[PDB]
Amino acid sequence: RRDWENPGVTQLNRLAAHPPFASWRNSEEARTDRPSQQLRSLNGEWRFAWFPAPEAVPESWLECDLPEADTVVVPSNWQMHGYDAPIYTNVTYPITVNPPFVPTENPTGCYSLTFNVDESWLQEGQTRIIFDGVNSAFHLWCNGRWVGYGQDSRLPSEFDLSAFLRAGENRLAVMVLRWSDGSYLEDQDMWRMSGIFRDVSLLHKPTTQISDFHVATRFNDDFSRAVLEAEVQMCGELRDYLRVTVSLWQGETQVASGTAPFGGEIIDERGGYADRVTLRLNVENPKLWSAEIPNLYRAVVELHTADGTLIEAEACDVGFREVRIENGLLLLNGKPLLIRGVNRHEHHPLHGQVMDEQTMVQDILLMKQNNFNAVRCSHYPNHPLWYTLCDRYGLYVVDEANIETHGMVPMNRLTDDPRWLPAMSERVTRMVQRDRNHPSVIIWSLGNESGHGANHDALYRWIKSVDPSRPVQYEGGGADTTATDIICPMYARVDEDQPFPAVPKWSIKKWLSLPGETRPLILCEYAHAAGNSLGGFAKYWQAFRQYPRLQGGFVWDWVDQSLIKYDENGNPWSAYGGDFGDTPNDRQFCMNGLVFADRTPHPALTEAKHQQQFFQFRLSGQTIEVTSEYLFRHSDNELLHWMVALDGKPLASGEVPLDVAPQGKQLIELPELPQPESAGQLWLTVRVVQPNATAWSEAGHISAWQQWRLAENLSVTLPAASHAIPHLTTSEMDFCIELGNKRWQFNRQSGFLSQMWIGDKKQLLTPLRDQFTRAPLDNDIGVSEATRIDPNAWVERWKAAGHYQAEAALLQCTADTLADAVLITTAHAWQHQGKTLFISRKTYRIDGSGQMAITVDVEVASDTPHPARIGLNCQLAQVAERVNWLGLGPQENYPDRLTAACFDRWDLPLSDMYTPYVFPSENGLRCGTRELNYGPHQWRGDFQFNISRYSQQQLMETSHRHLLHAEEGTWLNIDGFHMGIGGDDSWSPSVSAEFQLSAGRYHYQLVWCQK
Amino acid sequence: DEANIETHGMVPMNRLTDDPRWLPAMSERVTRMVQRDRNHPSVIIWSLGNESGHGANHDALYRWIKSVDPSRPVQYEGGGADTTATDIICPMYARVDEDQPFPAVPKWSIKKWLSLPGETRPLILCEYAHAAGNSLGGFAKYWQAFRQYPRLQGGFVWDWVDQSLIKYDENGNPWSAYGGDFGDTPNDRQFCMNGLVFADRTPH
Amino acid sequence: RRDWENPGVTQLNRLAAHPPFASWRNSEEARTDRPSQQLRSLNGEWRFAWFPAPEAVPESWLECDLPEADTVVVPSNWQMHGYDAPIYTNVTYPITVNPPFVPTENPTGCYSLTFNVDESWLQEGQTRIIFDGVNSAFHLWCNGRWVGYGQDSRLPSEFDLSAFLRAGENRLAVMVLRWSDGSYLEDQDMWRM
């Protein structure tokens, strides 16, 4: 029948979808959510054999174990066990686009399990098996007899095994196909894997059973009263003595209860549902659920007899909350939300796409600790535990259908085809039937990148009809089609329009006011965090806060989808597209997270945490105004600490308890701040601390911070003229300046400071030269490739302009003797085949104090692409352990991503000045620096810098971080100016104009001296 | 033009039409009809089917049509004749002046139906004036209302021709038969004859 | 697979629906709506045999004509030919309401036709067969090979016979089931045929 090549068949004998069941036979266990003996896990060791195609699977396998088989852990993805390679492709399908057909060479995973089943399970009731996740299609056999078939890799497939099992030993046989017609709807941008990757279990239910139940909560105007409505459905024989009791609990207190026999209200001319009943419970002053305060109640559904005998019980956590769009605003419990979200794929560097509780909790804790209050299930229903954790820890969730046909041409070819409506509908309807009772889920999504088809309109209406308590969104086809309640563009910029034909991405501010538009706008994807990115992140938040209808978005994305491989010595390294022989592939485009695969934070995470702060501050004189962006909670676990320092030197500090009502303000009057004597800039730094531990954070957690420049005292005092006078020694090839124990050497042929001495020690390994390039970041590269160059990408423009090949041509080099110093004057011309790109004019003034003042003035040809940087660089012979600087830190920060960084005195080990991005590039920069210290050296001024053991050349020529080798000495890059990193997206130029080095003429000055 | 979908005998009537498991089968009865007949000028209205209550599958397919063919209104009588799945209030056998307040699915006087709080759609009966045998009494009352009220734009009489079948007796003479005359049981006897004309098209 | 008891399977290898086609190879013919040499009718005398259930149909019927079969006119309803009784019920289904199942005693109509096909039709292009209406479900075979399946009694089911036909004589075998899961969606108040 080749059911895996027929979108008409998505399953055979599969049971109806429903909310999480456990079939408790004890009500107390149901109330407290304790384990159930009726729900058994089949996870553990299974037998597995790999085949090139289903036609190659031997028939004997159905009856007994294949001696060729291996014993492997389940759940798992077989690529992670080395049976075949995982494939990383973004848009292009991993198989030939010829729907509904798949390759004849279809990797087949043969799973089998021999397990015991107690007679008591077969004597009565129904025994079903549950496969929470099988990628991508499979046939099931039990004791040699065919049971069924199932598709959709991200939702559970359940089959009744009651007539197939026998007391004692039993054997299951599962033939999993990597490719199926379902694969045409699973083209998400992630590693393409397969296998039984989610839990497998057996559920026992009585013949007369609770087959489904829906919980809804409505409120009065001020949410002081609510009515909980629970519709319960049963299967089995109807008897007049049957009853259903729904009880609601707050802790160990029962706040409400309702009981009734089956038989719903009349719905039409034929009557009503005799196998259903709806209980309605009134709840006065319910504690409301929100990501701010995840208040939860427990609802227990009991099927029983009138005399009180329990048959079975089910239950769920209930969060009292109302979600609705009113007057163009997405409201929660009547308040306008501000979505601080992120897209999160289910990924593990070691286990692939298998999810575990520990990794989930770690992600949720890191998310809340970094001020995120929402997550988008990009782009498929998640492992069931995920919603339970979100309900309890408090996170707004966008549950998304497992539907993406990105690789089709046009994108909606299948979604606008009625022959694919059936397949698509099951991916939407079964998701809703499974997760509709979770309060964390506040918005339904029809899928991702599948254009806009009539099938979307139909499924949009289906959801609105069955679940009016949640808005429905979908980005495909222009982000504002008739299939979405929310304008949800991906990568729409703040101010810049991107007028693409048919599917334009308007500036978000402009999008809201288009003629006739009234919906709220929330980006389903924005701020693509590939590598050194998130430039311009603050521009989004300034806009979100100023415009009521701009209610936020979900960053793309949470974690790098890198995988682990080992070298010959067993040392692990991070691998990306193409490292497994997978081809074609999309290389590093699988890594766009705010954190590395092992959850180590990327510098960008801190910029997100700061911009997403819940308290806003303003300063006027001695008054600090604290404004709360919380909607429901008072600041009952917040303390404001303030500090005033002069160039990093603390003068005064204190703390004040925060007592701000949600949306409210608090004025804090700072005490008389004593004026400092010494010259310098005074800085005020405030931070909000949470004294007490929470379910998601430890005592002392910092949730917000901000700085302001206070008074500044310009230094006018003249340095006590040192008696010493430097001396110049001139030769044909050099200008040497001696001063006591120090010496400076300027090659007269190159025009650069080629060497320095402190005693008999050389300080340089490479001459101090101008630098106008940087090892390209992911954003500089875009989608450009050697086989497919993107002439528009920054890196390609720089390459074509000769920026990386530019040769320095000495125009002038003179030496003058002053009354108390030596003055070196140089001028260089950087040209590329007749074209002068840059001109550098410098002066070096060495006085008796041993200080070397360098003045640099650069001209950049207006017709050459704006350079990545304007600075100097050299390889220092020294290799010290610490790096001390007075500037923005402590973390890596760039011009368009430095709002989170604070000005102060920072000191870190040299290794922390390097950011280990899997794909190497310019990194570790620190801006707004007035003083830098390393070994015996000190540089002062107003510059940006990065310092490490890797040269820009090596970073540029190395594809993977683990392949980097520390060079001799230390490479120092000091920039007067550095281009922004961009990030609005990573496939087109995204560095905003105000962060491009287009001034034409630049000036910066540095003072180099030995401590 | 109406989709071949009627589940009248289910209890309740929408048991299948509100079940997502049946959405696939239903959608094909609707979509393939539209793909076949959309170029015919005579077809001015699409119908989702008949007597199958009102289920979520109806809302889905209603929207599908509006999306693929905005040139024709979409109607459906199930679930009360004025649900979210119909552009036209299309009751069957709603009377002119007399209300019939059935629970959940009332049949209001058509004059009254039009002005219920918030209602603005036109009203056209998908079925009215049941012509079983000696019938059509009160037919003129309907037309008087149709002509007086702009939004009462008519209706479709039920129905055109008697569904009687021919059988033969001893003398080989043919005679008109109805339910039960073929041993078919259970049956609904003469209820298959409600036309304005006899099976051979002779007028009643 | 008992495809007639699965609302998940409404057809097998059926071609997409579309507006009326005639495939004129002459524009003036298309303009004037005159008969097309590319659209042939297979209406007329066919071979028919009645069986109480699909399990009672002999396999030999796929390869050659059943001598016990009768020659009947098609299109037609077999109740009108007297093979079994037409049923008149209004609301109540004519079969036990147990979706998606139908009675095991499922009247099965076995239709067959020996017809000729011009070689020019097989030397190029695509030759399809169109059943404008089959009540209520059916399987199709051509020259003994299974072609497809289809449901919905009131719309045309089309199948590509290009790879099943030979120049000259060919034999179609059509097994029509009276009841199917499609029957749960066809409870209109009218005679059940």
Ligand SMILES: CC(C)S[C@@H]1O[C@H](CO)[C@H](O)[C@H](O)[C@H]1O
């Ligand atoms: C490569 C672009 C043309 S499509 C772009 O690629 C990104 C890679 O992280 C993401 O998958 C986005 O969702 C997708 O739209």
Ligand SMILES: CC(C)S[C@@H]1O[C@H](CO)[C@H](O)[C@H](O)[C@H]1O
């Ligand atoms: C028998 C009624 C309660 S239902 C009534 O029966 C009529 C018989 O001609 C028609 O079929 C109507 O459409 C139907 O609603």
Ligand SMILES: [Mg+2]
């Ligand atoms: Mg399939």
Ligand SMILES: [Mg+2]
């Ligand atoms: Mg995509």
Ligand SMILES: [Mg+2]
């Ligand atoms: Mg646990």
Ligand SMILES: [Mg+2]
């Ligand atoms: Mg700031």
Ligand SMILES: [Mg+2]
């Ligand atoms: Mg079927």
Ligand SMILES: [Mg+2]
């Ligand atoms: Mg009816």
Ligand code: NA
């Ligand atoms: Na809403």
Ligand code: NA
């Ligand atoms: Na806003």
Ligand code: NA
């Ligand atoms: Na990606």
Ligand code: NA
């Ligand atoms: Na507090």
Ligand code: NA
């Ligand atoms: Na690199």
Ligand code: NA
């Ligand atoms: Na009128």
Ligand code: NA
């Ligand atoms: Na009738």
